Design a protein around this ligand. Structure first.
Ligand SMILES: C=C(C)[C@H]1CN[C@H](C(=O)O)[C@H]1CC(=O)O
Lengths: 51, 50
């Protein structure tokens, strides 16, 4: 178990893993099409990421 | 001899004890640290073999 068990993976792996884990802080750029994307989308995660 | 010294090193590498277990503490430390070498080499082999 101390030679091959696993690699220490990142706590986040996707968009919804940021949607739950409030320890890892978000981020985007002001005046951007990424910020505008979360401002104007509503599908169950990307409003929560803009919340 | 040089034949019997290499039959200690191959013997203690394969976990099969030989006929010539050393006396004379200076050679028991050589025999004792080659036992701990081949203990770790085999137990790392058979734990990674799966
Ligand atoms: C560097 C910035 C603000 C620009 C670069 N092109 C994108 C754009 O022009 O919309 C932006 C990146 C982003 O939206 O994250």
């Amino acid at each position: 178990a101390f030679l091959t068990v696993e690699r220490m993976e990142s706590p986040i792996d996707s968009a919804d893993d940021l949607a739950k884990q409030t320890k890892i802080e978000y981020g985007a750029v002001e005046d951007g099409a990424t910020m505008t994307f979360f401002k104007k989308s509503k599908i169950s995660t990307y409003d929560k990421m803009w919340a | 001899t040089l034949l019997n010294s290499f039959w200690f090193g191959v013997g203690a590498l394969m976990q099969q004890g030989s006929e010539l277990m050393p006396k004379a503490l200076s050679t028991r430390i050589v025999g004792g640290i080659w036992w701990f070498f081949t203990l770790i080499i085999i137990s790392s082999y058979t734990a990674n073999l799966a």
